[PDB]
Every structure is written in C-alpha cells, then in structure tokens.
Design a protein around this ligand. Structure first.
Ligand SMILES: [Mg+2]
Ligand SMILES: [Mg+2]
Lengths: 113, 118, 195, 86, 101, 132, 133
RNA sequence: AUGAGGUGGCAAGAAAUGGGCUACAUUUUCUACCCCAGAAACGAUAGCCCUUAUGAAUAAGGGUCGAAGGUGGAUUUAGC
C-alpha cells in the first residue's frame, strides 16, 4: 500500500499542470471541497452521528429510575419537554443534562419529601 | 398507471466538467494564471517563468509562516473542517520509543530514525 | 521604466467568441473589454469618467459574462441532462389526487464563509381530509383534537415541524406523528363516547 | 369541561408537551430548557474576533518587514524623539 | 491586544458567563420552580450565592468593539454610533442609504 | 455646516477622485457601495462580523500594497467565493506585484478558511475627477 | 481554427429508484438594486424558457427600515442623522418540475448568482400516502 | 502609579428653576360597541400592603388611602 501511495503521488505530480479556465479553477476548488455544495441543504455535514427524532424527543426510556407521580417526575417531565422542544442541542447534550440531574438529586436523596 | 423518471447520481466535479467542456479554450489570451492588465501581462517566456516562480515562492513563504506560527490560523472559523487549510505538524512528541517509532514514518526524515535506532 | 502594451480593443475582432473570452463571472477588465462604455456624473461642460479608471463599474454588479449567446449555449447543452415531467400530471386537482400529501421546506442562501443557519430545519406539510379519512367518527375526533391546524374554507389540514434541527428529522417525525395521530383517532374512549 | 380537558391531554401527549396541568412557574422550566441562555448564545460567545490574534499577527508581520504600519512608524518615531530629548 | 482594561474585564466576564452558562441555567430553573421543596429552593439559592463573581450574563455589557463605547451601540452591527456613521459616510459597508424620505 | 466624508474646497490644486469628491449623501444616488453582501438585508446575520472582517481586509491589503493604490477597493462576495478588485500604479516591478498577490491571497484564504481571489488594474497616474 | 474533436462528456447513471416530483419551486430574490433584480429575473426566465418549463412573474413591494442617530458627538439632541436599509423583492414560480430538472436549474442559478442578492427557495413536492396508516 | 486587580457603599433632598404627563369637567366619568344607548355628577403614573416580569440579587397589575386641584403672575412658546 505504501509504495503504491508513493507511485500514486508521483503520477499525480506528473499529471497536474497550470490550468486555463475559471471553470477549471472552480473544478479545483470543488475537488478540495472548499466551494459550497449546490444544492445548499445547509446540512452537508453536521449529521449529529445519525441521531434519530425519537431519540431526541422521547425521553421515556431515559426516565426509568423514578415513579410516575412524584414532584421529581414532574420536574423531569418538564425538562424532557423543554429538551425535545429545543432543536439546538443534541441527544448527547440532553443525556448529559439528564445525568447531571440524576447525580444532583441522588446526592440530595437526603430529603425525599 | 404512473410513470416516474429514474434518479441519477452525479459527482460534484462532473457538472463543472460539463460546463468546461461546453466552452473551448480562450483565443488570443494568455493563461488564466497570469493577470489580465497589460502592464502585469507577461510578454516573454523567461519573464513569465520568473513571474510564476515568484508566485510559487510566495506560496512557499506562506507554507513557512503557517508552519512556523500555527496557533494564529488554528481557529477553525469555516464550518467545514479542512486539513488542507489547517496548519502543518512535524513536531516530535515526548520521549516514547514505541510512539516515537510509529511517528518515524510520519515525520519523514532521518535524524529521528538514527536516534530511534540508537 | 516598464511600459504596458496597448489594450485588447483593436486586437479583438468584431466576430468573436464572447462566451469563450468570458466563461465565468469576472471583473470588468476595461483593458480587455473593447466597449467604450462610460459611467459617472458628468461635470458642467464635461463627461463621465473613462472606462479605464471607472472603478464604479466594478463597484456595481457585473454581467458582461453570461451573454444571451452564452445562455443559449449552456441551456442547449444541458438540455441533454434535464428530464421530462410526466404529461399525465396536467392540473392541480390531478396532481393532488395522484399524491395528496404535500410537503414543503425552505432555506436561504447568503454570501459569506459559513453556510449553516437554523431556518434550514423548519418544514410544513398539508393534506385535505375530504378524501383521506373515509369515515366520520374519526373525522370528528381529529377535528376536535386539532385546534387551529385546519381550515375548512379551503379544506386542508396543515401542520408544521421545527422541533428537530435536521430536515430529515423534522420530516420523519412529522410522518410518524401523522401515523400515530391517525391510529389514535381510529379508536376512542368511554369519556369520548359520553359527551 | 372534562371533555375539552381530556382533549388537551391527548393533544399534549401527541405533540410532546405535558398532559398534566401545570403552573407558569413550572412552564418556566419548559421554556428555559427550550430556549438557550444568553450566556451560551453565539451572540454573547462571539462579540468580536480577538485583537490578540489580529495585533500579534500584524506585529510579527511588521517584524518580518512587509506591512509598513504608518501609525506604528509615527508612534515609535515620536518615541525615539522623546527618548532623545529626555 | 484588547482596546483597554475595561474591555479586558468585559471579555473576562463573557468568558466566565459562557463557561458557566449551563449550570447557571440549570440551578436557576431548579430555584424558580415552585412545586419542588422550598428547602430545595433555598439550598439552590445559597449555591447560586456561593457561585463566583463575574459569572452572570447580567454584569457584561454590549459594548462597542472598536472604541469600547458602551452607549450608542446597535446589537445587530455591534458598532458604536460614531464608527457606524464613519463607515456609512465612507461607503465601506453595503446596502445602506440616507433616509431622505 | 457638516463635515462627513468630504474634501474642503481648496484653491484648485488638489486632485480628487470620484468617490472621495462626492458626498456621503450621494451614495445610492451617484455612487456605488465598496462592498456587496447580504448581511445588511433582512433575515441574514453575522453582519457585524462581515463589517469587521472587511475592514481588516481593506487595512491589511492597503498596508501590504502600500504606495501603489490610489482609490478605495471593490469587494464582491458571491456566496462562498470572495473577490477583490484594486487599482494600483505601475512604479514597482511585476515580480513584486505577483509575489505580494500570491502572498496576500494565500494568507487571506488560510485565515478566513474561504476561497479568495483578487485582481488589480494598473494606471500610470491616478485618475483625477476634479481640481478642488 | 482550433476546434476540439472529441468533447469530453460527463458520466451519467440512471439509478433504479425514482426521482422526486417538485410541485412548485418558488424562489424569492432580495436585492438592493431594482435594475440588478430585473437583470437577474430576466436571466432566470430566459433560462427557464430555453429549458422548456412554465413561468410567472410578480414584484412584491419594497421594504425599508430606518432609524435615527445623533448627528454630532457630544451634546446635540435636536440635530440627528438618518439612514435606511432598502430591500426589494422579486418572486419566480415554476410548476410541474422534475427532481433532476430542479437539480440542474438550481446548480446553474446558484453558480450564476450576483453578489448583493439573497435567494430564498420554497420547494413544494407531493408524495403518496404512508404504509402504516 | 496619577497604572492595574477585588468588596462595599455612593447616587438623599430645608430648598429655587426647567421640559413633559395628569387632571381642575359636564366636549366631563363609567358600561358593550367605537359613535342613534343607559347611568354618575370629577381627579393619584403620590403613599401603605400584596402579586407577577427577568435577574444571582427596577417595571406592570390588584386592595386601601380618594387630597392639592375649581383652567392660569406679569410674561412667554409653537403653528399657513
Ligand atoms: Mg445640520
Ligand atoms: Mg429581578
């Protein structure tokens, strides 16, 4: 593989030559990818690791370690609501919020009132 | 019942290849690399050689400044991260015979290899 | 010391490939442009500035490239690549019959290095319930559930989606929401039977 | 009415928001976790690119000797004059 | 090389607010919630009180970037009125006309 | 009496160009904007960043091509690609001209992580609009 | 005299899956110069004609925002200076438009933008019903 | 150090004056509508208490208080 790459870069250095056309300059810009991707989806890249809409919105599975009626359940339900409403932050941010809240009230388990 | 045209897939460069093949070479015009105004217009082979060599020397100067002060251009302001634009790193790490050996083939020189063999 | 050669005006012929000498967008380059076009506020007993030092022609947007000849060339070139629309689709009613579920997204494009902008995420969709529900109980149930997403004058139910940053997330979440909404309007409850 | 209350409950269950009733001090939580804080918003995080980078680059490039900085020439010329005149 | 020490302080405040923006919002919600215990509200209050200074986004100021003028600055352009007028007169920026209506 | 982007009337021995001769209330009426972007329009953003970056661009290029320019620049930003247009004099060598052209273009591209291009128009002596 | 013999043509592949059907491509151009907008829309309509699709034109009104500033520096409240940002709209709608036609047309136009213009696409595509319903 | 950094308060009124707002009425006040009606024969954007808005720590709203005020000192301001 290595010597194949050396020979390939040699062949390239033999290939490349001074261009003649602004279209060729654009072809070069698009070869390195600096020129934008028409059609502009505004999302070419930043895929969020193939995350899922239900993974974002439905936090029912992330909410398992508390009953259905308590005030902690109330607060965490409203938290999941606001998080699903927020598109700006991803599943990683939502789960770190949730786990920080978990640590918070698990260290403050002294009350449970 | 229903007729539907089939989908096709193109390369990002293929469209511009078509656009370029559409148009022929410019007639009675110097290469695009050279400027358009008449004063800067290179009007001889030796001077044109020297001109684009000065341009290449400026390119090498740019490489030198970027690889001498990477922290200035370290900011990835552009949304698409591009290693072609990122600063270049030929910096040996701390003494580590195994990682140093793995970095040998990355640094592309001979003094590191002499020291590693030592 | 050095002296510049005269411009390309007298060099360029009357018969000339303007699309070839100006393939892409570029500045005015009066040295290459043979036209004496001038632009500038003339002085009393005076005239506008000559094309050479007229930097305002550069200030203004530029359209010397892409002549009508160039447009004809490129359109009759790309004619081979463009496809044909189905002739069976000939009217709005027939298109919405063939494919009732309308969906539309949108986004801006602006000058600058960055390209992302959150407005890319929003999408909306529409469907007329006159032909889709095929029943009356579920229709009354659904129209009672939805508060303002409908409009009976034009008779189309419309719903938006922005809760997700990704366009495809918005899309498939809207699809799944419509599916679950239909499946939940299918059934009923005792408090709904008692009204 | 109870019918409309349960309609709202179902609509909330479907569209994400809370079905159970809740006060404004609690919907505070919802809208806060919906809208990001100004402290983290880009409008605050990026108020301007760093004069650190700008001035350091321009100073290093002057030391290279390419950017004839008129203001700096003025400043250091008058500095020379002041240190000559005491 | 910021303009001056007050700009330096403002940027330090901005850094602190950015790097504490998460926990501040979290505990502010945990405070302003009502159904939860008032003792919890008070614990969160004293926690916010013990939080360090220059960490709030209230102490920062939308100051000018060029001349560090706090007043007379547009949130959109972020420039002082004087530098704005300077650039608008010199025609540096784009697409702005004098309102001679 | 207002003093804003205008030249004081002298005895008639001051060559002045179009843009600096005309007033700043003639911008849309008898001038063009030096830059062209959409941040000023509605719906866009980053306009402050656009202004800062183009001011720094103009300053840096004025000072890395010092003594040759004789007028303000023309900026043309079509989506991603940035285009610069300058008018300069022909006293120095094309060697230096091309060297600094490549140098500045590479630096701008590496800094802004954006495709940049720049063109220059030669003049023997700066065009004068009037003698004021 | 120099006319090339073999013009290099791109490679094309017709994938098995069907192309998407856009109901309406409604593009909205915001600009500062009515003449530039007229030239741009003339360009667009001529391209659409040469490609063989339907067209329509209409000009939404001009939107302006103005705000007042202090003319002087230190103490002058009566004497102010004013400014205005003018945006001019133009709409172009194209109906019964195939997916690949949309691709080629938007590539062409997006490469042929001018500088001082913003371009807002609204894409309307019809589709059949899901399977779970 | 007349530079820099971090805690605090400072920013009140025996008083005179300036610009604006409120009303001193029945062309007024309240009620639904913004104009075919019915009642009253007014006035607190000050003070006390409370709620809410954001903030880590002034503003709007509610109850009470229900006066000065009775249409202007020469003189003076703006308006085709
Ligand atoms: Mg005046
Ligand atoms: Mg507060």
């Amino acid at each position: 593989s290595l010597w194949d790459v050396e020979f390939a870069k040699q062949l390239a250095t033999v290939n490349e030559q001074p261009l003649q056309n602004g279209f060729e300059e654009l072809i070069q810009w698009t070869k390195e990818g600096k020129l934008w991707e028409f059609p502009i989806n505004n999302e070419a890249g930043f895929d969020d690791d193939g995350s899922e809409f239900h993974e974002h919105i439905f936090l029912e599975k992330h909410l398992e370690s508390f009953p259905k009626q308590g005030p902690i359940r109330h607060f965490m339900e409203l938290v999941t609501c606001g998080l699903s409403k927020n598109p700006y932050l991803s599943v990683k941010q939502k789960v770190e919020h949730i786990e920080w809240f978990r640590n918070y009230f698990n260290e403050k388990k002294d009350i449970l009132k | 019942e229903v007729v539907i045209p089939k989908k096709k897939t193109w390369d990002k460069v293929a469209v511009l290849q078509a656009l370029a093949s559409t148009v022929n070479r410019d007639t009675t015009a110097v290469p695009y690399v050279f400027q358009d105004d008449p004063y800067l217009m290179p009007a001889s082979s030796l001077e044109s050689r020297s001109f684009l060599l000065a341009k290449k020397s400026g390119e090498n100067v740019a490489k030198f400044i970027i690889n001498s002060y990477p922290k200035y251009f370290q900011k990835d302001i552009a949304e698409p991260h591009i290693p072609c634009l990122m600063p270049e790193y030929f910096e040996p790490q701390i003494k580590d015979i195994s990682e140093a050996a793995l970095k040998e083939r990355i640094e592309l020189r001979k003094v590191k290899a002499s020291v590693d063999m030592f | 010391r050095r002296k510049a050669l005269p411009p390309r005006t007298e060099k360029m012929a009357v018969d000339q490939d303007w699309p070839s000498v100006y393939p892409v967008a570029a500045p005015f380059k009066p040295s290459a442009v043979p036209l004496p076009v001038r632009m500038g506020y003339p002085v009393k007993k005076g005239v506008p500035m000559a094309k050479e030092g007229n930097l305002e022609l550069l200030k203004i947007p530029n359209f010397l490239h892409l002549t009508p000849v160039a447009i004809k060339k490129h359109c009759e070139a790309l004619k081979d690549f463009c496809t044909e629309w189905p002739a069976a689709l000939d009217s709005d009613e027939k298109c919405e019959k063939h494919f009732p579920i309308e969906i539309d997204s949108t986004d801006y494009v602006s000058s600058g290095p960055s390209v992302r902008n959150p407005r890319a995420r929003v999408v909306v969709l529409r469907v007329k319930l006159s032909s889709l529900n095929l029943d009356d109980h579920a229709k009354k149930k659904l129209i009672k559930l939805v508060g303002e997403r409908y409009c009976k004058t034009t008779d189309v139910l419309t719903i938006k989606t922005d809760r997700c940053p990704l366009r495809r997330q918005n899309y498939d979440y809207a699809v799944y929401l419509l599916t679950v909404l239909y499946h939940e309007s299918w059934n009923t409850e005792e408090w709904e039977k008692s009204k | 009415s109870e019918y409309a209350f349960r309609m709202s409950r179902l609509s909330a269950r479907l569209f994400g928001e809370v079905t159970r009733p809740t006060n404004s001090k609690s919907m505070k939580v919802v809208k806060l976790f919906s809208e990001l804080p100004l402290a983290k918003k880009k409008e605050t995080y990026d108020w301007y690119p760093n004069h650190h980078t700008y001035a350091e680059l321009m100073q290093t490039l002057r030391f290279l000797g390419l950017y004839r900085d008129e203001h700096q020439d003025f400043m250091d010329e008058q500095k020379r004059l002041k240190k000559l005149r005491g | 090389h910021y303009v001056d020490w007050r700009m330096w302080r403002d940027v330090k405040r901005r850094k602190m607010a950015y790097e504490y923006a998460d926990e501040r919002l979290r505990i502010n919600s945990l405070r302003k919630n009502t159904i939860l215990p008032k003792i919890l509200q008070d614990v969160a209050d004293e926690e916010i009180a013990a939080l360090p200074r220059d960490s709030c986004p209230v102490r920062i100021r939308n100051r000018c970037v060029m001349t560090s003028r706090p007043r007379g600055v547009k949130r959109r352009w972020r420039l002082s009125r004087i530098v704005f007028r300077h650039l608008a007169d010199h025609g540096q920026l784009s697409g702005i006309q004098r309102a001679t209506w | 009496k207002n003093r804003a982007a205008r030249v004081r009337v002298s005895k008639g021995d001051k060559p002045v160009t179009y843009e600096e001769a005309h007033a700043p209330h003639y911008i849309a009426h008898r001038k063009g904007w030096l830059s062209l972007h959409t941040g000023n329009l509605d719906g866009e953003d980053h306009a402050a960043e656009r202004t800062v970056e183009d001011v720094f661009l103009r300053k840096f290029m004025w000072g890395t091509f010092p003594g040759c320019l004789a007028d303000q620049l023309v900026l043309k930003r079509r989506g991603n690609q940035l285009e610069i247009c300058a008018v300069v004099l022909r006293q120095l060598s094309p060697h230096k001209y091309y060297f600094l052209v490549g140098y500045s273009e590479t630096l701008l591209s590496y800094f802004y992580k954006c495709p940049v291009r720049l063109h220059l128009q030669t003049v023997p002596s700066k065009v004068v609009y009037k003698y004021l | 005299v120099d006319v090339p013999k073999d013009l290099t043509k791109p490679v094309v592949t017709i994938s098995d899956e069907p192309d998407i059907l856009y109901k309406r491509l409604s593009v909205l151009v915001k600009g500062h110069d009515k003449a530039v907008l007229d030239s741009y829309e003339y360009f667009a309509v001529l391209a659409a004609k040469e490609l063989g699709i339907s067209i329509k034109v209409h000009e939404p009104p001009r939107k302006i925002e103005r705000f007042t500033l202090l003319q002087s520096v230190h103490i002058y409240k009566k004497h102010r200076v004013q400014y205005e940002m003018r945006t001019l709209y133009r709409c172009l709608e194209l109906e019964h438009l195939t997916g690949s036609t949309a691709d080629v047309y938007l590539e062409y136009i997006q490469r042929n933008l001018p500088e001082g213009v913003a371009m807002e696409v609204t894409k309307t595509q019809l589709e059949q019903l899901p399977e779970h319903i």
